[PDB]
Ligand binder design. Structure first.
Ligand code: NA
Lengths: 219, 219
DNA sequence: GTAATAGTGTCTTTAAGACACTATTAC
DNA sequence: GTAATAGTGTCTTAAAGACACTATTAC
């Protein structure tokens, strides 16, 4: 081993992306903010994914609905002690699902993505986060994967705004709706949610939203 | 460490993909065919990529023009001797650039992709290879990355046929030519290659072919 | 009624598919 | 001339952009 498994976990709340951060309880950089993650445990971990799920669960108490391997970083500069390797994942979950737990804890917090990009973070985690969010931004163009950051069920303009924040620009609502109906990835619950407008349909994500990719990108 | 760094290295020759295999010089499964790869050497390797390149160069004497990290596999099943982690890459290079040297050698061979899918390979390298070509097949739909498997310069129908083999079906020549023209990724050498037909333009790949993605997928 | 937010109709625009038509070589 | 392979012109199709329109709530 000597290897590490980290995760960049995103969610959406307050019309913004937040990212889960954990304050190191060990040297070096004890008390610096970093990504959740840690060493492999061969007694309970049977795959790398099992590890990153365990590290997340140990902080949020829930297994997130979406988890993709992002990349692995390894070199002799990211850590002053020498050669270090991290297998990094990207994940999405809903904010309510775990806000309650992380709040009664001080070494764990949802941070506003936008802020984070200004905080000094452990090792190369800032870069990893940027990489994660870039890849996420890509998925905004050709999947409905961002949906996994919402609570279920959700309205279509909720989903849309999440995409909009990721692309940093508005999206033709009509285009979005067309794509959604076509891709046949949402389950209409028949319920509605009203918030200062016409009541909007509430939908749940079909599982294969994770694997489904659009043939054309948005712009 | 204890980690390993492998590569699925493809090329194209005789209207088919071949993949570089290396016969294990060590136990276990000594003499079984597997991917080129190996341990990290902290004296001379400074990033993971430097490792994989060194492992490839040690067998081909050529640094491949395209290399992207595929994924990292780690669990307790793929190796009977317990927990095992491989960081695996996908690479492309041209066949002639390398054939000469590797024929001089016996524990190294270009294999026809189509065949490899039948012979037994070390550990989980079969799956890795399939992931590799699956993703390569994806790139055929929305990049010109397959080009890196050809020798420079090459004709557009040469490039096209490579895509066609990856997609396992024929492609509309006009569509391809439009896409290529629009993406402004080829350099016309003003040279021509005549082979049983009208002479065809010879082209070189602009470096940024590696990162360029089309807005719409082919079908 | 109005303000607000959800959702549609429909036209224009983009880029791919289909495929017949031309071009340039060896013979 | 024919056969072969490279490359075009152009109509049709699929799916996004733009944007005016209707719908359904709270007040
Ligand atoms: Na990866």
């Amino acid at each position: 081993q000597l290897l590490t498994v980290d995760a960049v976990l995103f969610t959406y709340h307050d019309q913004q992306l937040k990212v889960l951060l954990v304050q190191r309880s060990n040297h070096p950089f004890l008390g610096l903010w970093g990504l959740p993650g840690g060493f492999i445990d061969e007694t309970c971990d049977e795959s790398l994914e099992q590890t990153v799920l365990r590290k997340l669960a140990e902080k949020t108490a829930v297994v997130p609905p979406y988890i993709e391997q992002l990349c692995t970083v390894g070199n002799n500069s990211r850590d002053a002690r020498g050669w270090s390797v991290t297998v990094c994942y990207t994940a999405l979950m809903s904010y309510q699902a775990c806000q309650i737990q992380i709040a009664s804890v001080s070494d764990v917090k949802w941070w506003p993505l936008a802020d984070v990009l200004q905080m000094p973070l452990a090792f190369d985690h800032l870069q990893l986060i940027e990489q994660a969010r870039e890849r996420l931004t890509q998925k905004a163009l050709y999947s409905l994967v961002p949906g996994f950051a919402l609570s279920e069920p959700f309205t279509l303009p909720e989903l849309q705004h999440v995409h909009e924040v990721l692309l940093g620009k508005p999206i033709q609502g009509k285009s979005f709706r067309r794509r959604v109906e076509q891709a046949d990835l949402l389950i209409d619950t028949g319920l509605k949610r009203t918030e200062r407008g016409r009541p909007a349909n509430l939908y749940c994500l079909k599982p294969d939203t994770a694997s489904y990719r659009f043939l054309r990108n948005l712009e």
